């Protein structure tokens, strides 16, 4: 298992403008187009990323060119952030693959606000993260989702994603 195999469990592939479960407008491999409630602000927006008139539609190929640019985006968004780039390094090869996912879903400064479970997770002091992290919106609205990603913190391991 891996980022993109991870986060394609997490988000799934949908080649027809979607709603999030924030109901913002998506398409793809959880790529968000646009907060705006327009269908039209999305369709632009849509274009504007793929280089062509969508109306709409993309191709599975094009989902997968989204998904490799916001992956590597994610990464280095966390490399180049001062809270996040230090806790990164300080964690393995699986746990990494937690926190990228979380910023993925959240952005860098979404994930940058959960402080005291950063520290922890730097402290490697598991299970105490793993609790800290679950009072959060994050987990009260996406329960399945943060509670697969915790449990990857938890463990170290991809238990939670094998069931999946």
Avoid at 4 to 12: C, K, N, S, V, Y
């Amino acid at each position: 298992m891996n980022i993109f195999e991870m986060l394609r469990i997490d988000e799934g592939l949908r080649l027809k403008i979607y709603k999030d479960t924030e109901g913002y407008y998506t398409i793809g491999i959880g790529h968000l187009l646009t907060k705006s409630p327009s269908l039209n602000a999305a369709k632009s927006e849509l274009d504007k990323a793929i280089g062509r008139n969508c109306n709409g539609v993309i191709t599975k190929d094009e989902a997968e060119k989204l998904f490799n640019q916001d992956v590597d985006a994610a990464v280095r968004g966390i490399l180049r952030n001062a809270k996040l780039k230090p806790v990164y390094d300080s964690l393995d090869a699986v746990r990494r693959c937690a926190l990228i996912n979380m910023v993925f879903q959240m952005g860098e400064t979404g994930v940058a606000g959960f402080t005291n479970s950063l520290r922890m997770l730097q402290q490697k002091r598991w299970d105490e993260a793993a609790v800290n992290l679950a009072k959060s919106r994050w987990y009260n609205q996406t329960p399945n989702r943060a509670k697969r990603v915790i449990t990857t913190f938890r463990t170290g391991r991809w238990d939670a994603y094998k069931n999946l």
